[PDB]
Design a protein around this nucleic acid. Structure first.
Ligand SMILES: [Mg+2]
Ligand SMILES: [Mg+2]
Ligand SMILES: [Mg+2]
Ligand SMILES: [Mg+2]
Ligand SMILES: [Mg+2]
Ligand SMILES: [Mg+2]
Ligand SMILES: [Mg+2]
Ligand SMILES: [Mg+2]
Ligand SMILES: [Mg+2]
Ligand SMILES: [Mg+2]
Ligand SMILES: [Mg+2]
Ligand SMILES: [Mg+2]
Ligand SMILES: [Mg+2]
Ligand SMILES: [Mg+2]
Ligand SMILES: [Mg+2]
Ligand SMILES: [Mg+2]
Ligand SMILES: [Mg+2]
Ligand SMILES: [Mg+2]
Ligand SMILES: [Mg+2]
Ligand SMILES: [Mg+2]
Ligand SMILES: [Mg+2]
Ligand SMILES: [Mg+2]
Ligand SMILES: [Mg+2]
Ligand SMILES: [Mg+2]
Ligand SMILES: [Mg+2]
Ligand SMILES: [Mg+2]
Ligand SMILES: [Mg+2]
Ligand SMILES: [Mg+2]
Ligand SMILES: [Mg+2]
Ligand SMILES: [Mg+2]
Ligand SMILES: [Mg+2]
Ligand SMILES: [Mg+2]
Ligand SMILES: [Mg+2]
Ligand SMILES: [Mg+2]
Ligand SMILES: [Mg+2]
Ligand SMILES: [Mg+2]
Ligand SMILES: [Mg+2]
Ligand SMILES: [Mg+2]
Ligand SMILES: [Mg+2]
Ligand SMILES: [Mg+2]
Ligand SMILES: [Mg+2]
Ligand SMILES: [Mg+2]
Ligand SMILES: [Mg+2]
Ligand SMILES: [Mg+2]
Ligand SMILES: [Mg+2]
Ligand SMILES: [Mg+2]
Ligand SMILES: [Mg+2]
Ligand SMILES: [Mg+2]
Ligand SMILES: [Mg+2]
Ligand SMILES: [Mg+2]
Ligand SMILES: [Mg+2]
Ligand SMILES: [Mg+2]
Ligand SMILES: [Mg+2]
Ligand SMILES: [Mg+2]
Ligand SMILES: [Mg+2]
Ligand SMILES: [Mg+2]
Ligand SMILES: [Mg+2]
Ligand SMILES: [Mg+2]
Ligand SMILES: [Mg+2]
Ligand SMILES: [Mg+2]
Ligand SMILES: [Mg+2]
Ligand SMILES: [Mg+2]
Ligand SMILES: [Mg+2]
Ligand SMILES: [Mg+2]
Ligand SMILES: [Mg+2]
Ligand SMILES: [Mg+2]
Ligand SMILES: [Mg+2]
Ligand SMILES: [Mg+2]
Ligand SMILES: [Mg+2]
Ligand SMILES: [Mg+2]
Ligand SMILES: [Mg+2]
Ligand SMILES: [Mg+2]
Ligand SMILES: [Mg+2]
Ligand SMILES: [Mg+2]
Ligand SMILES: [Mg+2]
Ligand SMILES: [Mg+2]
Ligand SMILES: [Mg+2]
Ligand SMILES: [Mg+2]
Ligand SMILES: [Mg+2]
Ligand SMILES: [Mg+2]
Ligand SMILES: [Mg+2]
Ligand SMILES: [Mg+2]
Ligand SMILES: [Mg+2]
Ligand SMILES: [Mg+2]
Ligand SMILES: [Mg+2]
Ligand SMILES: [Mg+2]
Ligand SMILES: [Mg+2]
Ligand SMILES: [Mg+2]
Ligand SMILES: [Mg+2]
Ligand SMILES: [Mg+2]
Ligand SMILES: [Mg+2]
Ligand SMILES: [Mg+2]
Ligand SMILES: [Mg+2]
Ligand SMILES: [Mg+2]
Ligand SMILES: [Mg+2]
Ligand SMILES: [Mg+2]
Ligand SMILES: [Mg+2]
Ligand SMILES: [Mg+2]
Ligand SMILES: [Mg+2]
Ligand SMILES: [Mg+2]
Ligand SMILES: [Mg+2]
Ligand SMILES: [Mg+2]
Ligand SMILES: [Mg+2]
Ligand SMILES: [Mg+2]
Ligand SMILES: [Mg+2]
Ligand SMILES: [Mg+2]
Ligand SMILES: [Mg+2]
Ligand SMILES: [Mg+2]
Ligand SMILES: [Mg+2]
Ligand SMILES: [Mg+2]
Ligand SMILES: [Mg+2]
Ligand SMILES: [Mg+2]
Ligand SMILES: [Mg+2]
Ligand SMILES: [Mg+2]
Ligand SMILES: [Mg+2]
Ligand SMILES: [Mg+2]
Ligand SMILES: [Mg+2]
Ligand SMILES: [Mg+2]
Ligand SMILES: [Mg+2]
Ligand SMILES: [Mg+2]
Ligand SMILES: [Mg+2]
Ligand SMILES: [Mg+2]
Ligand SMILES: [Mg+2]
Ligand SMILES: [Mg+2]
Ligand SMILES: [Mg+2]
Ligand SMILES: [Mg+2]
Ligand SMILES: [Mg+2]
Ligand SMILES: [Mg+2]
Ligand SMILES: [Mg+2]
Ligand SMILES: [Mg+2]
Ligand SMILES: [Mg+2]
Ligand SMILES: [Mg+2]
Ligand SMILES: [Mg+2]
Ligand SMILES: [Mg+2]
Ligand SMILES: [Mg+2]
Ligand SMILES: [Mg+2]
Ligand SMILES: [Mg+2]
Ligand SMILES: [Mg+2]
Ligand SMILES: [Mg+2]
Ligand SMILES: [Mg+2]
Ligand SMILES: [Mg+2]
Ligand SMILES: [Mg+2]
Ligand SMILES: [Mg+2]
Ligand SMILES: [Mg+2]
Ligand SMILES: [Mg+2]
Ligand SMILES: [Mg+2]
Ligand SMILES: [Mg+2]
Ligand SMILES: [Mg+2]
Ligand SMILES: [Mg+2]
Ligand SMILES: [Mg+2]
Ligand SMILES: [Mg+2]
Ligand SMILES: [Mg+2]
Ligand SMILES: [Mg+2]
Ligand SMILES: [Mg+2]
Ligand SMILES: [Mg+2]
Ligand SMILES: [Mg+2]
Ligand SMILES: [Mg+2]
Ligand SMILES: [Mg+2]
Ligand SMILES: [Mg+2]
Ligand SMILES: [Mg+2]
Ligand SMILES: [Mg+2]
Ligand SMILES: [Mg+2]
Ligand SMILES: [Mg+2]
Ligand SMILES: [Mg+2]
Ligand SMILES: [Mg+2]
Ligand SMILES: [Mg+2]
Ligand SMILES: [Mg+2]
Ligand SMILES: [Mg+2]
Ligand SMILES: [Mg+2]
Ligand SMILES: [Mg+2]
Ligand SMILES: [Mg+2]
Ligand SMILES: [Mg+2]
Ligand SMILES: [Mg+2]
Ligand SMILES: [Mg+2]
Ligand SMILES: [Mg+2]
Ligand SMILES: [Mg+2]
Ligand SMILES: [Mg+2]
Ligand SMILES: [Mg+2]
Ligand SMILES: [Mg+2]
Ligand SMILES: [Mg+2]
Ligand SMILES: [Mg+2]
Ligand SMILES: [Mg+2]
Ligand SMILES: [Mg+2]
Ligand SMILES: [Mg+2]
Ligand SMILES: [Mg+2]
Ligand SMILES: [Mg+2]
Ligand SMILES: [Mg+2]
Ligand SMILES: [Mg+2]
Ligand SMILES: [Mg+2]
Ligand SMILES: [Mg+2]
Ligand SMILES: [Mg+2]
Ligand SMILES: [Mg+2]
Ligand SMILES: [Mg+2]
Ligand SMILES: [Mg+2]
Ligand SMILES: [Zn+2]
Lengths: 95, 107, 97, 70
RNA sequence: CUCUAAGCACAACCUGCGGGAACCCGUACCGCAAACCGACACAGGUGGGCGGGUGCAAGAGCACUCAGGCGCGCGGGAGAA
RNA sequence: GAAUGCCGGCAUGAGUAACGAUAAAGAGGGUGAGAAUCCCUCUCGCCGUAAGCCCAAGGGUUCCUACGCAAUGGUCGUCAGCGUAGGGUUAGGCGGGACCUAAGGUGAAGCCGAAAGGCGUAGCCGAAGGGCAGCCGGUUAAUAUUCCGGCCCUUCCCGCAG
RNA sequence: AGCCGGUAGCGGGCGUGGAUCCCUGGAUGUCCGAAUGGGGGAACCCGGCCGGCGGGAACGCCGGUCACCGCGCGCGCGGGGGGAACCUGGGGAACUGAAACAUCUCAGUACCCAGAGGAGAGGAAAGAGAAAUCGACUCCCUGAGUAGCGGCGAGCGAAAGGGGACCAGCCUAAACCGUCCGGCUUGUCCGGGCGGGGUCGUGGGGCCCUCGGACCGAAUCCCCAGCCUAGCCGAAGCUGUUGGGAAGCAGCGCCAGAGAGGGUGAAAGCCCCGUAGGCGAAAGGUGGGGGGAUAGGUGAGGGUACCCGAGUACCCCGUGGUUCGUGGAGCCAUGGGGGAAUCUGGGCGGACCACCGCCUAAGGCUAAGUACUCCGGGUGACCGAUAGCGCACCAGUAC
């Protein structure tokens, strides 16, 4: 059955995602089929926050090889949610 | 369906062929995939090891080599002789391995 | 150039044979075929429009079975048909086939 | 997860109402996400726990589906 | 924008103000080219817009030069036919 | 043993022709096992209705960074559009869709054809045409009319007033 | 009794409270695809209705539902598409052969299309054709390269009969009777439904009189055996010697309904896996065999002359099929034209006529014996990496 924890996969662990913690923009990897509105509700019921702004982008899987064998990494999608003034998602503040 | 094993960890077996013919040992491990067993203190090989956290200073280590399962025979914990294995149906009616020389259980 | 709704008469394939000479029967050397090719012999379809339950129904029918369209109309008197479309009525007639 | 514990999970699972089942899944689904996050930062050495929870959620839903289907 | 028809005229529409709501896909990099079409890091081919200054009658011509970009992925000598 | 036979391997021509625009180089300094060939500086030369810059097509990670040099690079290589890894593409207003139609395509009604199928007013699809609301600056190694700053605007839902 | 696939490693777990694994049934099954809410450049996009989720009216997500066509009184059942060959049907070449070429051949082949199905077609005589005879059909052998066909060239090429495989026969239409329904030209009406009756070639049936009053039995259904989809039991050897290694050699034994074959450090009946001989299914599939039910099946005379499949038979024109190419050209089929009869009817026995026989057209169905090999197994005087499938290897791939 579909829940919020099915929509949010893992947080984005990179120098650029960290920079957004300062201003309350958190960055998660999300399921590629999930809508902005869908991602809003999900982060909200997951972390008890108020989502004011959601920006999403797709990330192509990098093509890689093992000697003889050419292949592709799974395609991903990340979302950057803006929580309300003063709010925080502590789990990601982690760091 | 599954490989037939007349021997298992860790009943006692005679090595009846090869360089260790006649030795007796416990079945340390059974590798059904390769159809081979590991018999304690039998088939010792010298393997080289790189200097590591595992083996600093390094050099060599002694290891037991796998033996073709056919080269090994279980010993009867009753009569004490090397034997072939039979099967026997109990009243349960589960089946057990039994010695062919005497009717001993072999577990 | 098509199919008889009543009889199923269809276009068929026939040969057109070309012959020279005098038949043996009339004292001749014999008939030689100077050509054969395929051709089609079509049914003789015509339109048959009849009014049935106050509706206009039309049939594509080989001339041979033209009166068979009327026998249907005659047989169609025992059926409650009024109010239907011509498409439906035609199906009902054809069921009497 | 242990065999005996599986049987035990099933007995107690089959006694729940759908709603209790639905609620139970949601939590174990939430725990899966919690596991995934720590897995991300290399802070989950007992990684077998991930496979384990996935199958619990599976076993629950299978039973949720049991409850509804006849 | 306007006109009316079924309808509806506690509805409906227009205007002003407020609060709320606003999804999916693209966006990296080359792009007159070593990243496109030509089997090649190929003197070929590829649509649109910007394209400064001075001088030469004009100009998108021509010479030099701005910003910007390059010296073209083998070199060193010799000084014959 | 021959079929200008077939598949493969290895010779000869031969250290020969060539190394792909005659825009052009020189030195110093640095790095490194190794440097004409990578980085840095200075000097010299070439393009400038381009050999600069921005869009569309097409290509599809080639982008940025770290670590590398077997092969790819017509030489060399410490460099690279190359190997490994990690990072990177953020929109109600830009482009396309939730709008419109063009040739054409498809196609209720209807017509036609052995079968397969061919047609066909309406409608539907179809765009680089019509239509529609964002401008300037800052920030990143790498994105920006997308994030941030400032000042603006659009549609939809509900309410209130006229 | 090990296990977490090929796959070891890091990092962690599971199993005699029966894991891994194998078989059966079930659950889940994103998106596209017949693809079916609509659109579309397949795997993307966009909607209606009902119900749910969020603060939720806008926005979004979840669940269900919504294409078209056919048949049957909005609702139901069905249809669609795929499958290596095999099958039927609707279309249908050419090279080539004729030592040129046109009739002819290749060949109703290749191929296209439509439909079937585990098969398909065909099938219970309007047959054969001379036997005073046979008796559905299919399939093999023979008949026979015969009879014939043929620019009587090249070539093409049957059937009856005989030997076999298998075996099986049925349901309707019409007369007449009954009932529901509707028509307008009111009933002894015409017609359409459903039921009863009826199914034949020694002709049969309907109707009317006389007499006569349980055996069969499915191709349907149910049960069962048997089989398939995992499996299990399974006789008999030790010591020495050479050698890295015994299964070689030596010595002394032993099994055999098992001495097929593969393995194990070399060459093993007795070490392993097997083999001979046996055993095995809760579940699903099958079930042509065994049992049982059910549908269905069943008299004889005399009279009557009601019925016995229509644009049909039949004749003529144009063709195809057959061995038959226009030939003395019948037969079967039918595109055009003309156009009957119901047993004192009609077709056939190679123009036609007579005599003599055979057969019952114009409705439908029907196992088995036959074809093929995507798939599983068994066996080779079959290949052994240029061979064998294009592929022994991550191949319909790279290119
Ligand atoms: Mg689900
Ligand atoms: Mg940064
Ligand atoms: Mg909220
Ligand atoms: Mg976006
Ligand atoms: Mg992957
Ligand atoms: Mg076993
Ligand atoms: Mg030995
Ligand atoms: Mg010994
Ligand atoms: Mg058991
Ligand atoms: Mg003619
Ligand atoms: Mg003649
Ligand atoms: Mg004469
Ligand atoms: Mg002739
Ligand atoms: Mg007329
Ligand atoms: Mg006619
Ligand atoms: Mg006529
Ligand atoms: Mg389990
Ligand atoms: Mg009104
Ligand atoms: Mg007004
Ligand atoms: Mg407003
Ligand atoms: Mg949408
Ligand atoms: Mg997007
Ligand atoms: Mg961009
Ligand atoms: Mg850009
Ligand atoms: Mg470039
Ligand atoms: Mg550029
Ligand atoms: Mg040019
Ligand atoms: Mg240009
Ligand atoms: Mg350029
Ligand atoms: Mg070229
Ligand atoms: Mg190129
Ligand atoms: Mg070429
Ligand atoms: Mg190229
Ligand atoms: Mg170059
Ligand atoms: Mg070029
Ligand atoms: Mg040009
Ligand atoms: Mg100028
Ligand atoms: Mg001057
Ligand atoms: Mg001037
Ligand atoms: Mg001048
Ligand atoms: Mg001038
Ligand atoms: Mg000029
Ligand atoms: Mg110029
Ligand atoms: Mg110049
Ligand atoms: Mg200047
Ligand atoms: Mg400069
Ligand atoms: Mg140069
Ligand atoms: Mg240079
Ligand atoms: Mg010289
Ligand atoms: Mg020779
Ligand atoms: Mg040559
Ligand atoms: Mg040669
Ligand atoms: Mg020569
Ligand atoms: Mg050759
Ligand atoms: Mg040769
Ligand atoms: Mg060759
Ligand atoms: Mg060669
Ligand atoms: Mg050479
Ligand atoms: Mg020289
Ligand atoms: Mg020379
Ligand atoms: Mg020379
Ligand atoms: Mg060259
Ligand atoms: Mg030279
Ligand atoms: Mg050059
Ligand atoms: Mg040069
Ligand atoms: Mg020049
Ligand atoms: Mg230098
Ligand atoms: Mg230097
Ligand atoms: Mg260098
Ligand atoms: Mg160097
Ligand atoms: Mg430099
Ligand atoms: Mg200029
Ligand atoms: Mg693009
Ligand atoms: Mg390319
Ligand atoms: Mg690459
Ligand atoms: Mg970039
Ligand atoms: Mg890169
Ligand atoms: Mg670069
Ligand atoms: Mg570097
Ligand atoms: Mg290199
Ligand atoms: Mg080198
Ligand atoms: Mg390397
Ligand atoms: Mg190279
Ligand atoms: Mg090189
Ligand atoms: Mg080159
Ligand atoms: Mg090198
Ligand atoms: Mg270096
Ligand atoms: Mg490069
Ligand atoms: Mg790189
Ligand atoms: Mg904005
Ligand atoms: Mg919408
Ligand atoms: Mg549109
Ligand atoms: Mg439109
Ligand atoms: Mg069309
Ligand atoms: Mg079709
Ligand atoms: Mg049109
Ligand atoms: Mg529209
Ligand atoms: Mg459009
Ligand atoms: Mg447009
Ligand atoms: Mg436009
Ligand atoms: Mg716009
Ligand atoms: Mg738009
Ligand atoms: Mg503005
Ligand atoms: Mg940039
Ligand atoms: Mg950036
Ligand atoms: Mg802004
Ligand atoms: Mg008001
Ligand atoms: Mg693995
Ligand atoms: Mg470990
Ligand atoms: Mg059990
Ligand atoms: Mg299953
Ligand atoms: Mg689908
Ligand atoms: Mg669809
Ligand atoms: Mg829907
Ligand atoms: Mg469609
Ligand atoms: Mg709703
Ligand atoms: Mg809601
Ligand atoms: Mg939701
Ligand atoms: Mg839905
Ligand atoms: Mg079909
Ligand atoms: Mg089909
Ligand atoms: Mg045919
Ligand atoms: Mg057809
Ligand atoms: Mg034909
Ligand atoms: Mg043709
Ligand atoms: Mg010919
Ligand atoms: Mg030929
Ligand atoms: Mg010949
Ligand atoms: Mg010829
Ligand atoms: Mg010839
Ligand atoms: Mg010729
Ligand atoms: Mg010819
Ligand atoms: Mg031939
Ligand atoms: Mg023929
Ligand atoms: Mg055919
Ligand atoms: Mg064929
Ligand atoms: Mg089909
Ligand atoms: Mg069969
Ligand atoms: Mg059949
Ligand atoms: Mg019959
Ligand atoms: Mg004979
Ligand atoms: Mg002759
Ligand atoms: Mg023929
Ligand atoms: Mg016969
Ligand atoms: Mg016979
Ligand atoms: Mg037989
Ligand atoms: Mg009647
Ligand atoms: Mg009546
Ligand atoms: Mg009646
Ligand atoms: Mg009679
Ligand atoms: Mg029957
Ligand atoms: Mg055994
Ligand atoms: Mg044995
Ligand atoms: Mg020795
Ligand atoms: Mg021995
Ligand atoms: Mg001996
Ligand atoms: Mg034997
Ligand atoms: Mg043997
Ligand atoms: Mg053997
Ligand atoms: Mg060896
Ligand atoms: Mg021997
Ligand atoms: Mg031998
Ligand atoms: Mg053996
Ligand atoms: Mg047996
Ligand atoms: Mg057996
Ligand atoms: Mg009687
Ligand atoms: Mg009569
Ligand atoms: Mg008859
Ligand atoms: Mg008829
Ligand atoms: Mg006749
Ligand atoms: Mg005729
Ligand atoms: Mg003929
Ligand atoms: Mg003749
Ligand atoms: Mg004839
Ligand atoms: Mg006759
Ligand atoms: Mg005839
Ligand atoms: Mg005719
Ligand atoms: Mg007569
Ligand atoms: Mg007669
Ligand atoms: Mg006849
Ligand atoms: Mg006859
Ligand atoms: Mg005669
Ligand atoms: Mg006859
Ligand atoms: Mg049939
Ligand atoms: Mg049978
Ligand atoms: Mg059959
Ligand atoms: Mg059969
Ligand atoms: Mg096979
Ligand atoms: Mg061999
Ligand atoms: Mg090979
Ligand atoms: Mg091969
Ligand atoms: Mg070899
Ligand atoms: Mg194969
Ligand atoms: Mg390959
Ligand atoms: Zn014993």
């Amino acid at each position: 059955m579909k829940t919020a924890y099915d929509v949010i996969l893992a947080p984005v662990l990179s120098e650029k995602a960290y920079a957004g913690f300062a201003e309350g923009k958190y960055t998660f990897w999300v399921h590629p089929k999930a809508t902005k509105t869908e991602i809003k509700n999900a982060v909200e019921t997951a972390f008890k926050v108020k989502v004011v702004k959601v920006n999403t982008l797709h990330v192509r899987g990098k093509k890689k090889r093992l000697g003889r064998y050419l292949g592709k990494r799974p395609d991903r999608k990340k979302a950057i949610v803006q929580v309300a003034p003063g709010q925080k998602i502590e789990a990601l503040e982690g760091l | 369906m599954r490989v037939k094993m007349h021997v298992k960890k860790g009943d006692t077996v005679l090595v009846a062929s090869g360089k260790y013919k006649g030795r007796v040992g416990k079945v340390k491990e059974v590798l059904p995939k390769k159809y081979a067993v590991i018999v304690e203190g039998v088939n010792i090989v010298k393997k080289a090891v790189r200097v590591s956290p595992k083996y600093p200073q390094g050099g060599f280590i002694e290891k037991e080599a796998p033996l073709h399962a056919s080269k090994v025979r279980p010993i009867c914990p009753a009569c004490g002789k090397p034997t072939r294995v039979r099967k026997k149906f109990l009243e349960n009616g589960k089946k057990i391995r039994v010695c062919a020389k005497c009717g001993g259980a072999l577990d | 150039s098509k199919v008889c709704e009543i009889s199923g008469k269809r276009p068929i394939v026939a040969n057109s044979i070309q012959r020279r000479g005098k038949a043996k029967r009339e004292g001749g050397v014999g008939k030689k075929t100077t050509g054969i090719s395929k051709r089609r012999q079509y049914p003789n379809l015509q339109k048959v429009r009849v009014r049935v339950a106050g509706q206009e129904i039309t049939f594509r029918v080989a001339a041979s079975h033209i009166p068979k369209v009327y026998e249907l109309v005659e047989r169609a008197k025992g059926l409650k048909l009024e109010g239907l479309s011509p498409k439906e009525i035609k199906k009902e007639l054809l069921k009497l086939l | 997860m242990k065999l005996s514990e599986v049987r035990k999970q099933l007995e107690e699972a089959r006694k729940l109402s759908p709603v209790e089942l639905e609620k139970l899944v949601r939590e174990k689904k939430r725990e899966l996400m919690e596991l995934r996050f720590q897995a991300s930062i290399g802070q989950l050495s007992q990684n077998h726990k991930i496979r384990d929870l996935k199958r619990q959620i599976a076993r629950l839903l299978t039973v949720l589906n049991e409850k509804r289907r006849q």
